[PDB]
């Protein structure tokens, strides 16, 4: 967007099940959306040159050509499909796995003011945080990955000395290795931003967080010329349903209707109910307001009860 570079069609590669990258990361992976109306597979067959021209057939054929069109030109294959929730877990696992290794290396001095019994307490939680289905002393376990200056200080303090710390002293006087040779790519190239991207505790995945990111980039895909499909809008809407989050229903639908997409009436019945099932009639009026302006016929089952629910609070 900063360089006004439109999203290439290769980036907007139409995967199977008709879910682009705008919704391919949501929890239902390779699963169809929940549009109110039934799918129109006959139309999909027609639009994919299936009549006479050609169709991208998913028959697995013997050979080393990748069947998946998304794998075209990678080198080996696409990265293995993982959801945003799964990716958050791995970052959550690996961060605490690094904490355990750092804790295991020192134990007492890293904690400093903790007791030996607490050292086991801060281990079992770390052990349980990993592979898992209080004083929380873990906050003081500081990881220094990529901090060149930190490691140089620890490096400073016929046969080489047995003690590793004394061995480091021998190298500097014998010119085997010194701090001048101790550098990485980040600092020599002025990657200042790299400092604040690794030694941070990852935020655990939240469904309300996922839809916030879903609506943020969906608009950004629109700004760059990308056109998310009808299935993409349904999937992100459904993620906004599993968690209640009634506030984001309006902004999802107006963006969906801005592309000409119209959800099925039974889905519209489901969403209107959820917008007043838990008692959130506020913002449950605009959902039925703008959808009429766009030209969508609201079923009378919802209209009668929403009006009945309208006078219920009165």
């Amino acid at each position: 967007r900063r360089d006004n570079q439109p999203i290439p069609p290769r980036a907007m590669i139409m995967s199977r099940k008709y879910r682009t990258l705008v919704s391919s990361w949501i929890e239902p992976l390779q699963e169809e959306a929940e549009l109110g109306y039934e799918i129109d597979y006959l139309a999909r067959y027609v639009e994919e040159g299936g009549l006479t021209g050609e169709r991208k057939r998913w028959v697995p054929r013997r050979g080393k050509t990748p069947l998946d069109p998304d794998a075209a030109g990678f080198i080996y294959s696409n990265p293995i499909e993982t959801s945003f929730k799964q990716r958050c877990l791995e970052d959550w696992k690996v961060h605490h796995r690094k904490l355990l290794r750092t804790l295991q290396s020192e134990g007492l001095p890293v904690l400093g003011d903790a007791s030996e019994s607490d050292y086991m307490r801060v281990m079992e939680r770390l052990r349980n945080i990993i592979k898992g289905p209080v004083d929380e002393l873990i906050c003081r376990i500081k990881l220094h990955e990529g901090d060149t200056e930190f490691w140089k200080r620890r490096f400073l303090g016929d046969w080489f000395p047995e003690e590793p710390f004394e061995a480091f002293k021998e190298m500097r006087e014998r010119k085997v290795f010194d701090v001048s040779d101790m550098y990485t790519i980040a600092d020599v190239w002025g990657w200042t931003w790299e400092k604040d991207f690794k030694n941070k505790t990852p935020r655990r995945w939240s469904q309300e967080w996922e839809v916030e990111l879903a609506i943020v980039l969906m608009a950004k895909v629109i700004e760059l010329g990308g056109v998310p499909t009808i299935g993409d809008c349904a999937v992100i809407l459904r993620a906004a349903i599993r968690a209640p989050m009634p506030s984001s229903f309006l902004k999802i639908l107006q963006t969906t209707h801005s592309l000409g997409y119209a959800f099925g009436s039974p889905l519209y019945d489901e969403i209107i109910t959820l917008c007043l099932d838990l008692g959130e009639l506020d913002a449950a009026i605009a959902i039925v307001a703008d959808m009429e302006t766009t030209g969508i016929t609201v079923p009378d089952q919802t209209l009668d009860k929403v009006i009945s629910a309208r006078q219920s609070n009165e």
């Binding site: 697995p60 013997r62 080393k64 990748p66 794998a71 080198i75 080996y76 294959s77 293995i80 592979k131």
Partner: protein, 86 residues
């Protein structure tokens, strides 16, 4: 050998890399088992998986088909090189 050759042809080399990697990742997730014999075998399996995916990664980056390990034609040495043992 027909079973092997067809099985080699049927191999999805992309899939072999994917499932071996996650299986290899899973084995190291548990970590130590407290038994030397069990830890002995977990090393063998992990090295087997690494060797397997390394073999697969080489096949798809070159023009060598794994079916060729099971030959249906046998070349014959020129007569001059085998005058009258082989």
């Amino acid at each position: 050998a027909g079973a092997i050759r067809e099985q080699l042809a049927d191999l999805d080399l992309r899939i072999i890399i994917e499932n071996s990697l996650v299986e290899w990742k899973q084995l190291g997730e548990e970590g130590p088992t407290g038994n030397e014999w069990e830890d002995r075998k977990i090393v063998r399996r992990k090295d087997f998986l690494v060797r397997r995916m390394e073999l697969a990664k080489h096949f798809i980056r070159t023009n060598i088909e794994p079916e060729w390990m099971v030959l249906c034609l046998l070349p014959v040495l020129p007569p001059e090189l085998r005058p009258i043992d082989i």
